Nucleic acid binder design. Structure first.
Length: 343
RNA sequence: CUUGUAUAUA
């Protein structure tokens, strides 16, 4: 097409492309041009493009390059224009949220439209909550709905999740949604999610996706509800019972690190006490089967040892530091990092 | 062991 050739080989404006706007949106270079202009163009030039491609808004939403232009009409468009797009999305929320490129439009839309329009569209997913969470695209729409709409207006999300909370916490996308529900949810909503997890802590810590859900609970302050305090303690105790093993684990090691980093004075000392040498003599002559030496030699546990040095109390730090120094004398990047940070 | 984990468009 002539106008597209005039663009790439050379400047034009939105008034010059009145005949072929829809053609411009679907092309890559033609789209990036329209995105650029919509940010700076006056209302008149924006209306001209809009009133031309308004009928093909759904098709463009789904488009590889056209979806950006519809996004820009939410970001830079007028109230009347935003309302027109919303009216086209009604009855199509399930479909659009599943589409690879249209879900990006739905997510952008939720950020810019008014509170009443956000819930109105999201209510169309009230019966497909589990479907959407498990979807590669639809979970991001759910995540966005939680972030943009108050939980008190979204009772259908958690109520459709009761009984599936442990399964989703070990799922790729579900763990992202659970974290979001714990963040934006009320005291009662956090209760309902953690009740279904307070029985399976060892499994979550060692899981490839669950350990992130654990890590999120670990980095919560004591300012939160009564449940969050109890569950945090359960995690610390569980890690305290298996300090050596968890630190030698690929996924669980990160949980140990977060435990000694965000845990309270008492909680932190409980974990270290399982590793700490008994006195000055034990630290100087450690056996190869002691907690310290089993951790320093390990590929994952050495980071926990490194993490211990930083967060340790004057008395505890004194015993750990000299224990590492003793290991260097008897005998990789793991030992290089411990070496220098001691010196 | 130049050392260790999860989000989808040009």
């Amino acid at each position: 097409s002539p106008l597209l050739e005039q663009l790439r080989n050379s400047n034009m404006s939105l008034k010059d492309i009145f005949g072929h706007s829809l053609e411009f949106c679907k092309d890559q270079h033609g789209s990036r041009f329209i995105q650029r202009e919509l940010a700076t163009s006056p209302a008149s030039e924006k209306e001209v493009i809009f009133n031309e491609i308004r009928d093909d808004a759904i098709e463009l939403s789904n488009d590889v390059f056209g979806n950006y232009v519809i996004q820009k009409f939410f970001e830079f468009g007028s109230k009347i224009q935003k309302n027109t797009l919303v009216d086209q999305f009604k009855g199509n929320m399930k479909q659009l949220s599943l589409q690879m490129y249209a879900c990006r439009v739905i997510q952008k839309a939720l950020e810019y439209i008014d509170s009443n329009q956000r819930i109105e569209l999201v209510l169309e997913l009230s019966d497909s909550v589990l479907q959407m969470i498990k979807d590669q695209n639809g979970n991001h729409v759910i995540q966005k709905a939680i972030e943009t709409i108050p939980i008190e207006k979204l009772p259908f999300i958690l109520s459709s999740l009761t009984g599936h909370i442990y399964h989703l916490s070990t799922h790729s996308y579900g763990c992202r949604v659970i974290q979001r529900l714990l963040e934006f949810g009320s005291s009662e909503d956090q209760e309902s999610i953690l009740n279904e997890l307070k029985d399976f802590i060892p499994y979550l810590i060692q899981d490839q996706y669950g350990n992130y859900v654990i890590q999120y609970v670990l980095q919560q302050d004591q300012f939160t509800n009564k449940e969050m305090v109890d569950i945090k303690q359960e995690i610390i105790e569980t890690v305290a019972n298996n300090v050596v093993e968890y630190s030698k684990h690929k996924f669980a090691s990160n949980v140990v690190e977060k435990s000694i980093l965000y845990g309270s004075k008492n909680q932190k000392d409980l974990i270290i006490s399982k590793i700490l040498p008994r006195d000055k003599n034990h630290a100087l002559n450690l056996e190869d089967d002691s907690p310290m030496i089993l951790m320093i030699k390990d590929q994952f546990a050495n980071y926990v040892i490194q993490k211990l040095v930083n967060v340790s109390e004057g008395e505890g730090k004194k015993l750990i530091v000299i224990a590492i120094r003793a290991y260097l004398d008897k005998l990789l990047a793991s030992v290089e990092k411990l070496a220098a940070l001691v010196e």
